[PDB]
Amino acid sequence: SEAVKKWVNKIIEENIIAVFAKTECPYCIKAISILKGYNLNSHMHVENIEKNPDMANIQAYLKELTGKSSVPRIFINKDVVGGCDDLVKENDEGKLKERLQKLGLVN
Ligand SMILES: [Hg+2]
Numbered sequence: 001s002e003a004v005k006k007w008v009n010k011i012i013e014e015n016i017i018a019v020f021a022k023t024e025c026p027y028c029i030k031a032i033s034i035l036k037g038y039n040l041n042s043h044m045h046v047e048n049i050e051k052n053p054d055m056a057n058i059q060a061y062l063k064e065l066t067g068k069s070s071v072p073r074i075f076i077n078k079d080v081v082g083g084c085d086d087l088v089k090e091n092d093e094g095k096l097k098e099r100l101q102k103l104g105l106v107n
């Protein structure tokens, strides 16, 4: 499906912070909470891809883009962050803040 790919692309391209998630997903909730703790709400979009008729197509495309089909899948300014654990590594090692600083999202 070109349609599914274009829809996913629009989510990633029209939101600086794009998170693909599913219902009742503890590591989705943790990742989203970390990002909101940086006061990123205004530039964040969370898409629940389980509440979607094309979940499998979306997951397969997310795997083409990132190497994994699992949620959460996290993009920052179209760059692949990855999953919650990737976000935690970046956060703890200062890479996340650096990322956000270059975008003007944190001082
Ligand atoms: Hg679920």
Ligand SMILES: [Hg+2]
Pocket (backbone or CB within 6 Å): 015, 044, 045, 046
């Ligand atoms: Hg949005």
Ligand SMILES: [Hg+2]
Pocket (backbone or CB within 6 Å): 027, 030, 084, 085, 088
């Ligand atoms: Hg994590």
